Design a protein around this ligand. Structure first.
Ligand SMILES: [Fe+3]
Ligand SMILES: [Fe+3]
Length: 783
């Protein structure tokens, strides 16, 4: 009888997945995921997606080919194509609009959603599909299944369609709906197949064989907040303000609205307050999960640790980079190991989030349906790339209005107090409710700006200014700038280096070491000056407190975030010293260059005598929102649907997805074999335990010995370096059974530019790109 998949277990026996069962299960699970959002369309797509496997040629292939080809016989990427039979059947048995709509989902369920005319042209595939359809229907008739196994009804689709589109379909919003249904199809297909791979009858069965609910998470959060309150009852200025913010968040959580903002002072508890708002709001309005998306130029780990401490290990899913195998190493198992964000708390970048929302491929689109009915927290949303701000805010508008999503725009840009101005965080959204509107104290820093005449300082001159000072955090705008400044510093200090040339784990270890030095510094007990050279990745969620911060010229919000690491708690008996300098030009994205330009023009307008003032912030956001092309790459008209009697439904999914890939200048992921610190069977130190680790091995020890102690705790090697070698072998044996390795490798990835080039510098392994250890240095990372 007809099968959908075949697999071979480690004892070399063969198991097969019955086709009829898989079609029914995928239909039902897709309809379940699609919920109230026109689920009949998803059901039909699940029912039809594998119709082409009824071809006798397909069943013959899956029974007669080699072991590897039999296990990968459904990966059409010669294989026997099967995805387009069900697409053609939909077109033939339904009206033009519904039929072609479904054809997009069904025919893309392996290759990704296509363009109509151009890339992967769905028009050509349909015009060439008569044989595949006829053979599939032959097979289906030959089989046992009842005549009405495919009960395709225009009228029922009409009713479901108009239930979702009360006013008919908007040609410019149609792609969001089709991508959502495509997500339902893909996630249900993959989950059912993964059930089969583990021997279970269906996805529900595997689920019941073996995540706390948001109620338990909320109770944990309350326990954690209460012990934070008791543990450090400062009864201080800062604790008072944090309390006021938390109370306003808890109050605003009851409001029946979809767009909120949370504007607080730096060090004001932005993350924990946003999480409390989100938990309570989610419980009151039936949101199913919380998504926390931070700027791409961040250390995700450092933000995620707050959530890990508040709510425990098993709840937080950390997902930033794309660890995709190259197409040539895609197998059935790697295909199934993709992320669907079914976890209740997700920590991610806004690039991962919105590039998934605009994607064509199944690996990126799988997670999409789990975003509906969620709370999404955008940390510093105003830094979303300006040139994509129109599609992104259009996306957000639709998701908030029609798909149950709540957005909270968090920013630490509350001005230093005459607060007679509001701000528009994102120029394109409907009205956004500000959570902290109750007002009212003491200054924390003094800020110095570069000269209006526009002159720049050499790296040596800036290093000389820094080296004249006992303790400085210096923040620069690019990795090369970090290298040049670090090199320029003298060798009589303790100097350290952070940039995105370093993997997360390396960064977190440097951060913990800096904490130890700082604790010594604050007791008057560090015998060398302390200089940390970092990029902007430190301003996004790293909690460090320096007495002096040097900041390269940048947008006023970036300057405020930098000052947030200078006398952060307001505990020092003198104001912090913040020096904004103008060096060699540079910036990692056109949007950050735009911020720099706005700050320069404000400086030339004499508006920055008090750079954190209400006047300064209002002027910065008005000028920023007056500048830049908000859809530079034409996303909106690429994804706007064109209809006609000849071409019922034309959308450029494939071209749009590829064009959106420029949101980060085509970032390519790269795995780096940085040997981590571990403790004794060697176990790598958990990311939120590093601080305790450094205290246990270093407290009471002279600084002159620290390095040797640290070097002794590196992950032990055998008599690629070890953890990596075992990990890659685990991926090679069975990447779905050991898919957890993928998540581990996320801490040892950096992203570089497709532009940059030695021959064996980079190799491939387990389908993933890896850098040879010779090219990754202990201080600077890669180059
Ligand atoms: Fe398929
Ligand atoms: Fe399938």
């Amino acid at each position: 009888d007809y099968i959908a998949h075949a697999r071979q277990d480690s004892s070399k026996n063969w198991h097969s997945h019955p086709l009829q069962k898989h079609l029914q299960k995928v239909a039902q699970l897709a309809k379940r995921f699609a919920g109230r959002y026109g689920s009949l369309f998803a059901e039909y797509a699940g029912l039809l997606h594998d119709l082409g496997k009824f071809q006798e040629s397909f069943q013959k292939y899956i029974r007669n080919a080699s072991g590897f080809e039999k296990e990968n016989a459904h990966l059409e990427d010669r294989k026997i194509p099967h995805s387009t039979a069900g697409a053609k059947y939909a077109v033939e048995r339904l009206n033009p609009f519904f039929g072609h709509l479904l054809a997009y989902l069904i025919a893309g369920h392996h290759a990704g959603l296509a363009d109509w005319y151009d890339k992967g042209s769905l028009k050509r595939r349909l015009q060439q599909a008569d044989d595949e359809l006829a053979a599939s229907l032959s097979g289906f008739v030959e089989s046992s299944l009842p005549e009405d196994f495919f009960p395709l009804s225009d009228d029922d689709l009409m009713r479901d369609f108009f239930a979702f589109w009360e006013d008919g379909a908007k040609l410019e919003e149609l792609h969001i709906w089709m991508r959502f249904l495509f997500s339902c199809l893909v996630d249900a297909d993959f989950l059912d197949t993964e059930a089969f791979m583990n021997g279970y009858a269906d996805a529900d069965t595997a689920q019941a064989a073996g995540f706390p609910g948001l109620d338990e998470l909320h109770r944990r959060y309350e326990q954690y907040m209460a012990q934070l309150s008791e543990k450090a009852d400062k009864n201080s200025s800062l604790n008072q303000e944090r309390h006021a913010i938390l109370q306003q968040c808890f109050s605003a959580a009851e409001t029946d609205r979809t767009l909120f903002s949370l504007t607080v002072p730096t060090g004001g508890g932005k993350t924990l307050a946003s999480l409390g708002f989100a938990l309570k709001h989610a419980l009151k309005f039936g949101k199913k999960r919380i998504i926390y998306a931070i700027p791409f130029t961040s250390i995700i780990e450092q933000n995620a640790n707050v959530f890990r401490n508040a709510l425990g290990d098993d709840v937080v899913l950390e997902h930033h980079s794309n660890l995709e195998v190259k197409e040539d190493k895609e197998t059935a198992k790697t295909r199934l190991a993709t992320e669907n964000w079914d976890a209740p708390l997700i920590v991610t970048t806004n690039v991962q989030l919105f590039e998934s929302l605009f994607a064509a491929k199944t690996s990126r689109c799988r997670k999409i349906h789990n975003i509906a009915d969620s709370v999404v927290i955008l940390d510093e949303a105003q830094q979303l790339p300006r040139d994509f701000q129109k599609p992104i805010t259009d996306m957000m508008r639709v998701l908030a209005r029609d798909y149950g999503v709540t957005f909270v725009l968090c920013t630490a840009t509350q001005p230093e107090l005459i607060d007679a101005f509001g701000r528009t965080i994102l120029e394109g959204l409907p009205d956004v409710r500000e959570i902290v509107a109750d007002k009212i104290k003491l200054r924390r820093v003094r800020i110095k700006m570069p000269p209006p005449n526009g002159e720049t300082q050499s790296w040596q001159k800036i290093a000389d200014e820094i080296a004249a000072r006992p303790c400085v955090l210096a923040v620069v705008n690019t990795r090369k700038h970090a290298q040049k400044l670090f090199a320029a510093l003298p060798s009589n200090g303790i100097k350290l280096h952070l940039s995105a040339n370093m993997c997360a784990t390396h960064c977190s270890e440097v951060i913990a070491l800096v904490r130890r030095y700082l604790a010594l510094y604050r007791a008057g007990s560090l015998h060398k000056p302390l200089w940390l050279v970092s990029t902007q990745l430190i301003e996004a969620g790293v909690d460090l407190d320096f007495p002096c911060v040097y900041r390269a010229m940048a947008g006023l919000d970036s300057i405020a975030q930098a000052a947030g690491r200078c006398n952060r708690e307001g505990k020092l008996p003198q104001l912090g010293e913040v020096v904004v300098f103008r060096a060699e030009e540079g910036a990692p994205s056109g949007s950050l260059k735009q911020g720099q330009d706005i700050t320069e023009e404000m400086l030339k307008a004499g508006l920055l005598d008090d750079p954190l003032s209400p006047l300064a912030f209002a002027e910065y956001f008005r000028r920023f929102n007056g500048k830049g092309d908000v859809d530079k790459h034409g996303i909106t008209t690429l994804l706007t649907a064109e209809a006609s009697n000849e071409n019922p439904l034309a959308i450029k999914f494939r071209t749009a997805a590829e064009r959106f890939h420029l949101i980060d200048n085509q970032g390519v992921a790269l795995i780096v074999p940085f040997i981590p610190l571990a403790h004794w069977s060697p176990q790598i130190v958990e990311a939120n335990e590093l601080d305790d680790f450094f205290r246990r091995h270093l407290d009471g020890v002279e600084v002159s010995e620290w390095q040797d102690i640290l070097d002794k705790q590196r992950f032990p090697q055998p008599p690629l370096p070890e953890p990596f070698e075992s990990w890659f072998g685990l991926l090679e044996s069975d990447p779905l059974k050991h898919k957890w390795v993928y998540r581990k490798l996320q801490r040892y990835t950096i992203t570089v530019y497709e532009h940059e080039l030695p021959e064996h510098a980079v190799f491939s392994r387990a389908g993933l790109l890896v850098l040879d250890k010779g090219y990754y240095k202990a201080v600077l990372g890669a180059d």
